Symmetry: C2
Subunit: 192 residues, 2 copies
């Protein structure tokens, strides 16, 4: 079991390898985490103990990846300056072919029938790629007036439409900046 | 990498240890899979080399799982009519699926959905369906079935001598068969969609 700090150090190492094509040095980890090189080495040694990495400098291999362990978020609240306050419930391993390199992702459990005509059902998980922008027609996770919803996003001029995919429901329209885009729905996972 | 036989050997080893508290022998593995004792041993050697198992000092009673493959699910690219066999399956790839979607005590496979036959159950062309391997079904189950040499996804109903394979699509016809002619490949238990 990883501590919060160990998880963050391991993700940094994995992401550095993905970006650069070789492992980070102890000094690089120390810079990232604002700790001494000695402190960074201590995290490396711990990750090696728990079997997540194998260890000249940069002699580092990932033995157990956590990059595809995607956070499942439940509640999201509007905080200071409407920053999204996310309440993590779990991490779920998502198959690599469903994830885009280059983005972070989270999962949400679908509540209700707002997206049923897009074949997204109550109880599904949606895989959300984190982004604060959207194109018209994108299925987004958005927050407005402290409500998180899934909807198709449209902007025309100063107005954003959050359009359900359900003939029993109506679209909602807002002054554009009131709508915080949390990300774009890029996968759906359903247990029957 | 693994063959299907090797994956299934590893699943058997892991479940056997869980149930019994000791690992199966070479001959227990051979009889389980209708392969030769020598064949079973060659697999253990290969799987140890691949890091999936350990056998300290090469002793059978020390056989243990080092890397579980319980999440590794075969994507089957083709299932076609056989001659001696009803169905012949071709492995396309493996996809990692969380155990939360899997039923304990069963094996599973994935199929890529082709067409609109299940659209009213919100299963779309290009989705993967996770199929739990079983050769029976209950009314209202979504099944992968082989009938008349062809594989379909449908809702299953049985009323005595007759099975109905009902598409979840108003515009497509239910198909009715003598019950004994319907080979159930398994029950759809999950749906995975990449947008």
């Amino acid at each position: 079991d990883l501590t919060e700090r160990q998880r963050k150090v391991l993700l940094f190492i994995e992401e550095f390898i993905e970006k650069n094509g070789y492992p980070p040095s102890v000094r690089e980890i120390a810079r990232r985490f604002r700790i001494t090189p000695r402190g960074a080495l201590l995290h490396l040694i711990a990750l090696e103990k728990k079997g997540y990495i194998e260890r000249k400098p940069r002699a580092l291999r990932i033995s157990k990846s956590i990059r595809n362990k995607i956070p499942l978020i439940g509640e999201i609240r509007a905080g200071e300056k409407r920053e999204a306050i996310e309440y993590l419930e779990d991490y779920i391993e998502i198959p690599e072919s469903f994830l885009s390199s280059g983005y972070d992702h989270f999962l949400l459990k679908v509540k209700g029938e707002s997206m049923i005509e897009e074949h997204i059902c109550d109880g599904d998980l949606v895989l959300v790629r984190r982004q604060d922008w959207a194109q018209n027609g994108d299925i987004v996770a958005a927050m407005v007036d402290g409500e998180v919803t899934l909807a198709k996003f449209y902007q025309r001029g100063d107005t954003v439409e959050l359009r359900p995919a359900n003939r029993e429901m109506s679209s909602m329209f807002f002054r554009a900046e009131k709508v915080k885009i949390l990300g774009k729905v890029v996968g759906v996972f359903r247990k029957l």
